[PDB]
Amino acid sequence: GPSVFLFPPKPKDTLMISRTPEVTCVVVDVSHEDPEVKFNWYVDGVEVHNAKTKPREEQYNSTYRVVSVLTVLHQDWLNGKEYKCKVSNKALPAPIEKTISKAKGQPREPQVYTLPPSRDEYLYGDVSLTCLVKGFYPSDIAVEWESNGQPENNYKTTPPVLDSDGSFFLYSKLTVPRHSARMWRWAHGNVFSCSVMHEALHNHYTQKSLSL
Amino acid sequence: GPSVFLFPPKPKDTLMISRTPEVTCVVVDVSHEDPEVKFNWYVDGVEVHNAKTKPREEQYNSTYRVVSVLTVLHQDWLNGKEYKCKVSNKALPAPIEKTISKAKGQPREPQVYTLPPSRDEYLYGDVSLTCLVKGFYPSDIAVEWESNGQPENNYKTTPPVLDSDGSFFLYSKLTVPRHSARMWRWAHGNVFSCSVMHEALHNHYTQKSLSL
Amino acid sequence: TQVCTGTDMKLRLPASPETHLDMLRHLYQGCQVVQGNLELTYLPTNASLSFLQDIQEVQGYVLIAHNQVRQVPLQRLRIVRGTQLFEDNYALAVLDNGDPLNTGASPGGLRELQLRSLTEILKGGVLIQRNPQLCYQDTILWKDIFHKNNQLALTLIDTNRSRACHPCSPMCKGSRCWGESSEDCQSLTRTVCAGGCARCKGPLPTDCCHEQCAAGCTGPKHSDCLACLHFNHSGICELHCPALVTYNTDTFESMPNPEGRYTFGASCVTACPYNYLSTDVGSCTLVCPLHNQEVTATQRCEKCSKPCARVCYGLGMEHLREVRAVTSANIQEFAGCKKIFGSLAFLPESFDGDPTAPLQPEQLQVFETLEEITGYLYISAWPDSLPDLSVFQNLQVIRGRILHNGAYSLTLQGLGISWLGLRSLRELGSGLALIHHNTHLCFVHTVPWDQLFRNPHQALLHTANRPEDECVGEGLACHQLCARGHCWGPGPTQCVNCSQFLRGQECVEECRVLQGLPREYVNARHCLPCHPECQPQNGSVTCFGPEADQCVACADPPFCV
Amino acid sequence: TQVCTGTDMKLRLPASPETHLDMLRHLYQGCQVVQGNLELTYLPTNASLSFLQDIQEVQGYVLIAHNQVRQVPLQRLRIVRGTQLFEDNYALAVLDNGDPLNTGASPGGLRELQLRSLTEILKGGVLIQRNPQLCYQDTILWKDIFHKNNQLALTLIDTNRSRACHPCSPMCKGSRCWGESSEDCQSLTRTVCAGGCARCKGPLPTDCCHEQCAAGCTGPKHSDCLACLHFNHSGICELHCPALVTYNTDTFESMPNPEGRYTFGASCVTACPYNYLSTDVGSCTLVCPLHNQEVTATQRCEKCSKPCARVCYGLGMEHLREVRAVTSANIQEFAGCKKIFGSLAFLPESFDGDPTAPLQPEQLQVFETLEEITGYLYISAWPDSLPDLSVFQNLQVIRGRILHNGAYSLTLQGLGISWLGLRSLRELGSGLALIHHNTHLCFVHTVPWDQLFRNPHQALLHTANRPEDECVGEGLACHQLCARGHCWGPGPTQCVNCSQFLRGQECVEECRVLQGLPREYVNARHCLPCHPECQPQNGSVTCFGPEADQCVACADPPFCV
DSSP, rough: OOOOOOOOOTTTTTTOOOOOEEEEEEEEEOOOSSOOOEEESSSSBBBOOOEEEEOOOOOSOOOEEEEEOOOOHHHHHOOEEEEEEEOHHHSSSSOOOOOOOOOSSSSSOOEEEEEEEEEEEOSSSEEEEEEEEEEBBBSOOEEEEETTTTTOOOOEEEOOOOOOOEEEEEEEEEETTTTHHHHHHHHHHHEEEBBBSSSSSSSGGGEEOOOO | OOOOOOBBBOOOTTSSSSOOOOOOEEOOOOOEEEEEEEOEEEEESSOOOOOOOOOOOEEETEEEEEEEEEEOOOHHHHOOEEEEEOOOOSSSSOOOOOOEOOSSOOOOEEEEEOOOOOOGGOSSSSEEEEEEEEEEEEEEEOOEEEEBOOOOOSSOOOOOOOOOTSSEEEEEEEEEETTHHHHHHHHHOOOOOEEEEOOOSEEEEEEEEEOO | OSSSSSOOSSSSSOSSSSHHTTTTHHHTTOOOOEEEHHHHHHHHOOOOOGGGSSHHHSSSSSSEEEEOOOOOOOOSOOOOOOSSOOTTTTOOOOOOOOOOOOOOOOOSSOOOOOTTTOOOSSSSSEESSTTOOOOOOOOGGGGGSSOSOOTTTOOEEEOOEEESOOOOTTTSSSSSSSSSSSGGOOOOOSSSSTTTTOBBBBSSTBBOOOSEEEEEESSSSEEEEEEEEETTSSSOSSSOOOOOOESSSSOOOEOOOOTTTTTTOOBBBSSTTTTTTBBBSSSSOOOOOOOOOOOOOEEEOOOBSSSSSOOOOOOOOTSSSTTOOSSSSGGGTTOOSBBSOOOBBOOOTTTOOOOOOOSSSOOOOOOGGGOSSOOOOOOOOOOTTTTOOOOGSSSOOOOSSSSTTTTBBBEEEEEOOSSSOSSSSSOOOSSEEEEEEEOOOOOOOOOOOHHHSSTTTTEEOSBBBBOOHHHHTOOOOOOOSSSOOOSSSSSSSGOSSSSSETTEEEESSSSSSSHHHHHHHEEEEEEEEOOOOSOOOOSSSSSSSSSSSBOOOOOOSSSOO | OOSSOBBBBSSOOOOSSHHHHHTTHHHHHHHHESSEEEEEEEHHHHOGGGGSOEEEEOOEEEEEEEEOSSOOOOOOOOOOOSSBTTTTTEEEEEOOOSSOOOOOOOSOOOOOOOOTTTTOOOOOOEEEEOOTOOOOOSSGGGGGGOOSTTTTEEEOOOOOOOOOOOOOOTTTSOOOOOOSSSSOOOOSSSSSTTTTSOOSSSSSSTTBBBSSSSEEEESSSSEEEEEEOOOOOSSSSSSSOEEEEEEEESSOOEEHHHHHOOOOTEEEEEEEOTTTTBBBSSSSSSSSTTTOOOOOOEEEEOOOSSSSOOEEEOBSSSSSSSSSSSSTTTSSGTTOOOOOOOSSOOTTSSOOOOOOOOSSSSSOOOOGGGOSSSOOOOOOOOOOOOOOGGSSSSSOOOOOOOOOOOTTTTEEEEESSSSOOOOOOOOOOSSSSEEEEESSSOOOOOOOOOHHHHHOOOOOHHHHHHHHHHHHHTTOOSSSSGGGGGGGSSSSSGSSSOOSSSETTTEOOOSSSSSSSSSSEETTEEEEOOOOOOOSSSOOSSSSSSSSSSSSOOOOSSSSS
């Protein structure tokens, strides 16, 4: 039968006051003849009913997509708090109860740095640029780039992984194509760096420059 | 209710003739009073019944673990072929049919290299050593280390990810603790490299040295 | 820092006396005493001289002449040493301080001297001739200011006088009036002293003063002294500063003496100030003497691992001491001289037959080589056919010890150039700046002279040159990318700290990497030329390092070919 | 390569004539002709001389004497030029080839010469005195082998003879028998020639031969020549090799001439072989002449940007040509000489009063400086108090142009040292190796001499020294980590290519990084000392680069302090 899960907030929005993360509860695969549904948001089993629900969207599955946004002040998520999206329908006789929340352990201050590409990896075409992080905890983290104060968008990255150190580690790729704005600065060796955000970070932020 | 999936072979064993990969079909969560089960291996819907099944193993779930190994000559997997593990029980009235197999697309020759750690990432303690790969396809790949011809085991790595290039990319971490054998060679700058194995690789193998 | 320096004017005629007026507020304001000659000339009644309120000592000849003021606020001065002397003879002189030409009520000169604070003199005499309109001369018996030495160091005084005098104040012993006021009475320290005693506040041996001490004393003890002979050692009057080192009992075995002090300007101190020298001899000075050359460690003067190193000397040196200026001769004597040890200057006497030979424009550009000078500069004329002075495309610093008229790090006036291009300057030693009489000149106030200074006393007097308000005509302005407008002239070459990158000497946006045929790479906000062997590329940057290695586009194993 | 070189023995006495026997199979086997003097002395009947089968030319004096053989396989030789002459007079000589002391059936000397192939001679005469037991002397009229020059270049022949002769072969014109066989008849190229014609195969002008040509000819054309005067230019007899360059019509404007050829050993060729020199003059030689010094580009000889550079010279040079060996004098004349331009050697005459002064051990170790020599070496004695010759801890190469007795790159014998330590050698120029009479010596066969060679002709003759089979006594062996056993002596210092890393001169496992107090880093299989300022560490390696930058453990922004 059908089944549905929710979506957590974005670390880029968390740990940043002005930003507004969003605990989101998506719903899909409505019944061709029994699609009705309504939400109820609980806090450890405490209803608030203060969410903003959105319309529907059809899909190639001949069904509709439903979702509602939930407001955040970050505190209760910063110190720890569980949420619960209660939904329903007729195709399924049971309600929903999911114990999604922040986790806790031994927080690790991100061990951070920058590194160039390899002489041999120069080739011709889309060169790579990277920036790595390890010794951090937990896995909820996302980072971005900055360039002389200006941003970059053509980047990508990877999820974290565990090892014997009891922490996490990963890198972020940055595509840098030929005859483009991504490399003009690099060849000219200006301020490149990695904008990182994480809980264990002192002031919840650090940074590392990069150039030739 | 209960449900069960299988396990694919290991790339380290594939693409290497002497090695013998293993298509494996694990089973878990037997019923406290209806545990019976038997296997049947099909090829596109063609029974062979030439597998090697193993005994059981209890778990904290108060249930047992069951599995059987399947033989490989690599060819049919090298050129492409689907497998199917047929199981059964009484707790569930339906059999099982899974279309697990190798995938195909535009194979990409792994773009490979080596890189050192950062001067600033030296610190004191377990230093990092790395080796990266990108521009490869598909994601089925696993690599290992070599040192003057000798192996290393304290390493770890990450899965792949997609980007705008239509290929994959990742790195592998190598823990290198203080006052240890991992760093003695590095400080002495001997032959370190990354032993890579992949389909698109010319001769299904390449390598890149590393030192100071 | 807390003092000023002597000068070398000798009945000299500066230009635009409004600058001569400002020529010294930056010198003597906040100054206690002088290191050399003090020279006062050409000053009318209009005078803002409060900065001279606090003066105490002199090292060279004092001088006044052709000065038409009615008052001088010179007080608290009690020492003159006379290391240098007018006509190599006198310690202080006065001449023709009046007006022989033309409502306003005024005499046209000076009436009285008023210098009660003066009590001590050393080697040197005094002259005062042809000084009408002043009284209270021949009034105080100069001898009682002289030492037991220089008793025969004669003097000479004016008698031809115009206006009548007044009797000295009744509150003064005899007729010792520097001025009609009792505030200008006199005390002396010669005759009343205790027999051989040199100085005293009274005939009592308790009022007698220390030998090395001078100017009297509140008590013959050192701290109680008034005019320390050779230095004020942290408030003490001793004869010689403590030696830097000391040799052991009876061995050629030296070892430092922390209490040692360098000798300089009557001040036993630890180190030598900026612009000055350090010597194992033990004296901060302005010249590195015989068989002794200079290095750094910030400067110091000691012998090297070879006889006197052969280098180029400038004017005022051991063989250019009595030179006027540059001529046809001794011009190629600067051939490729990385660093001159002297000074130089230009006059019309160079650009004239001088029947000898004159100079020429094209026999130049040697100054594209110079990286440092020791002395000053001075200019008077220049041909019209030469728009600029780019020839100095690169000079690091002047570091001028010796100065023109003993006051200027450089001088320039009477020319017709349009602009200037001394771009590679970040520092300047002693000496004061000066400029005027440059008609076509522009891009003058585009300079942060204060940055180039290294001594707070320095400044710049400028006038008689086309201003920015009119130079902008036709669209004059500092270069685009030059930061904060710190240009010397047009073109990026004349930049200083241009955030954009440069080629040898041209700041521009494009360190053309891969879009200019001779490829390039980057380092230190500066463009560098890619290796030759590295073939041209077109994907991304063609080179990765200056040398043949660290290249990509190959045309021995790591090289290209 | 395809030739050999002359020698300098003059009735010389080598040691262990079994080496003298092997002294030349490596020289003349596969050799066509000689570049200098050919010297044959001290050889008994036992003789493996087949390698002398093919010889064609000479440049210096030939010599035989004190040789007791009954045959010589010298044939096909048809030229002698005589650039050097015995007693500076003769082109070839023979003396006392017999036995004055004691079954076996033999005369005890040589009976006949047999040299039919000889047809041409240049500057020089011949002597043959006190040569009993040989016939067919005074047989062939030497004059017809001489040129139109040297007709007055006298000769002298022996007459005192022991055994009777035989009449010349009846198949020969007159009495011209180098040997009793018709295979040793004679042809000549002097009298029968066409008047002024120099050489000919017959009196016909068609049989006449080219002027520059010699030894006759199949035809007077160049290719048809037999003995090219000054070179065999790709099979041609021309007088002078083509010039390297050419000057234009009437201008001081040079330009290369590809057809040009360097002058050397009668062979116009493109470049100069190894061990030799290149000159704009146009001659490969063994000396860089007056006002002309050496550089590389592999060697070349031309003037520099300065008069003759002042450097150190060795023996056999413009002021050490007639020297015997080293003495108390001219020893500190090698003070810190990075590169000598000569040769040297040691004898007992140095270690003896020589009433002058003798030498001493401690006045040595200057050879810890030398990095290259030009000539050879030779030793005869050495004190017992000196175990080894470590003083040569570092010398790069010999590159010996001039050779002892004109054959040896170096020589050593008659000593009592235990081992040797010439470790920094990877190459050797011309000259042959030699060693013997070294009692205590060991670690001899631990050397890959073949590696050091650069000329296939080279080898090594060794004997009269304690062998490995007995040197192992007490446990002698090449150092542990020295690769493949290529030691010169004990201790890692004497390694060559030691895979393990080294400190200055000590190959060991531990480039102690962080486990030795003075920390270290690594580069090029060699240990380097960490920076001073970088504080000691203990987590991992303390340093990352030689300079103050690229450090971690700090005690200006990038430096430590």
